[PDB]
Design a protein around this ligand. Sequence first.
Ligand SMILES: O=C1CCc2c(oc3cc(Br)c(O)c(Br)c23)/C1=C/Nc1ccccc1
Ligand SMILES: O=C1CCc2c(oc3cc(Br)c(O)c(Br)c23)/C1=C\Nc1ccccc1
Lengths: 330, 330
Amino acid sequence: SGPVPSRARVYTDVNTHRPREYWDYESHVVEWGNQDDYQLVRKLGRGKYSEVFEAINITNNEKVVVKILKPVKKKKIKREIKILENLRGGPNIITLADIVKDPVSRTPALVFEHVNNTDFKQLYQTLTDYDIRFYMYEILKALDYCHSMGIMHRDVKPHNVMIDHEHRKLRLIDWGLAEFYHPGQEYNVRVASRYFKGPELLVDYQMYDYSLDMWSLGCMLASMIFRKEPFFHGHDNYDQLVRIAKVLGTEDLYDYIDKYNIELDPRFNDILGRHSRKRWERFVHSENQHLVSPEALDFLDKLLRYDHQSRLTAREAMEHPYFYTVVKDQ
Amino acid sequence: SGPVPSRARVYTDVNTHRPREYWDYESHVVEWGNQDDYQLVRKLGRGKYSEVFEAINITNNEKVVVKILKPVKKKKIKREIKILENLRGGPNIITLADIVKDPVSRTPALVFEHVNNTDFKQLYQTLTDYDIRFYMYEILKALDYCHSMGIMHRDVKPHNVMIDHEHRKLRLIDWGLAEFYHPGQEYNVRVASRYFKGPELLVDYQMYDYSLDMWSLGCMLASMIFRKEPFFHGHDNYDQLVRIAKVLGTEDLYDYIDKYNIELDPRFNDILGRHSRKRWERFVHSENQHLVSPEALDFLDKLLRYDHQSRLTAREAMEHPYFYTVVKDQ
Ligand SMILES: O=C1CCc2c(oc3cc(Br)c(O)c(Br)c23)/C1=C/Nc1ccccc1
Ligand SMILES: O=C1CCc2c(oc3cc(Br)c(O)c(Br)c23)/C1=C\Nc1ccccc1
């Protein structure tokens, strides 16, 4: 019969009511800048699609960040450029300062505002209960904005959340996997990091929406309050769903499979088995108890759901009793 | 009430006194040549509307340049062909040698005289103060001629100015966006490059004239004397006007808007703000001081005006004290 279609529960037809050039990124003309305005200082890291350097804008002695793109299809480059321009000025969204062509790579190199990042492998172990709520609220402001703009990030993870802890500043980065949401469109399920892949990606349900980003957020929240990064630490795509099934149970998983008439890879038969839905108190101990609370568990439970339709929206999440103390201080 | 109409203050009724077939390019019959007379040697570049090749005319072993047109409406091809033929023989205007259609592909290919171009990204950095004045005077000879012929280029920019520095030769190219001027006609504002769009294009005033080309010339002149490419470096069409307003001030901008009763896109409200008219000394430093002079700043100021009627004409510009040394050498 085929899989049952699905629509986004919020921001469904926002892109349809936009001018074509808003989401038709293939017809976007890149306005290149002067590459000689930036001198590379040092390399900051290497990804699979780019290399990131710290540079200086010699026109005004500003610290910038140059992301030299590894060779990929120009369609994916135009997509990232168009999304960054559409989201420019949004809350906690990284700002694209300029676009230049690199001398050596002969490749697009995106220039961004600099963010003095604190490594999450060092920051998360020092986060208090209030620090987690504050930053979760800042990520939610960025996610709610880009979702309202008809865009899903599809790669939410601690590495893609730059935090300047001294100034309590946060920027959501790495929009190379972001995509415009269109009702009824079937997307590539091989997106995001394996630890943050939603169940819809693991069971290959291609008609997903913004709710994919909310699952990844729950994975981040679980890692921070339980002091286990990553929380679902799987070896592959199949074992990733098994790690999830050992916590959320298998009864809800097969209900999610029966609801959307998803056909399972037969490999999942011999590895999934039967598992009960575990209570979050199982993962609470003396080292993380100061970060776990009834608010945190209720908020986490409303994010980690098999059914992507039943997850909280970014705006609904911002109105949870978990962020009450954050909102009044803001 | 609607926007206030405007006429060109020079060369207003030149096309009206011409025979219809001079400007009625829709009724122009193309004189095709023999496609077998040209053999392509190598590709020189790719644009959005064409591909440029170096070829040889096997009838006389002449180096030529073949511009194979990408698929566009044949009305626009007739327009470009008609303008090039009307302007053939004019000072510093590229010469259309022949027009051919491929037998199999049926695709237009324009044949031009060859010009050994020096890349402006390598040439401009080696230009002296006198070199800039000399070539600016050569561009003005081409603009004054085509304006007197009732044609506006609508895409003046360094990429469209071929320079053979060894022979002190200059040719204005790429007439695909050029159009005949007719009093009272409203034109498409979606022309030229983002960095060289005049204010009338950014506020959507369709009854513009030759003075649009003069604004683009000021943008070129500013980039060359200040060593800043692009000078008005905007992220989009809206931010482009904001970058202009941060230099020319907002007081003159709203006066220009109130004079012609232009209604602004409400998006401009939250981004324009209030800005003072900056002095040109702000962009002068040790690397460009040998190119900046009281004449250059006075000439640039008389070109970059919001009010298109108050900008210098091409002939008025040629009679500026900036080109005094150039004229006596002629
Ligand atoms: O500060 C920035 C700006 C944005 C950005 C950075 O890395 C990226 C990787 C990708 Br992929 C991407 O799309 C973006 Br945007 C960015 C980044 C890193 N800073 C840093 C790192 C280590 C120590 C101190 C500072
Ligand atoms: O001699 C000509 C004839 C006119 C013309 C030329 O390039 C164009 C590109 C476009 Br787009 C266009 O519309 C036109 Br007309 C032209 C050109 C020479 N270019 C060159 C020379 C050396 C290296 C690289 C490029």
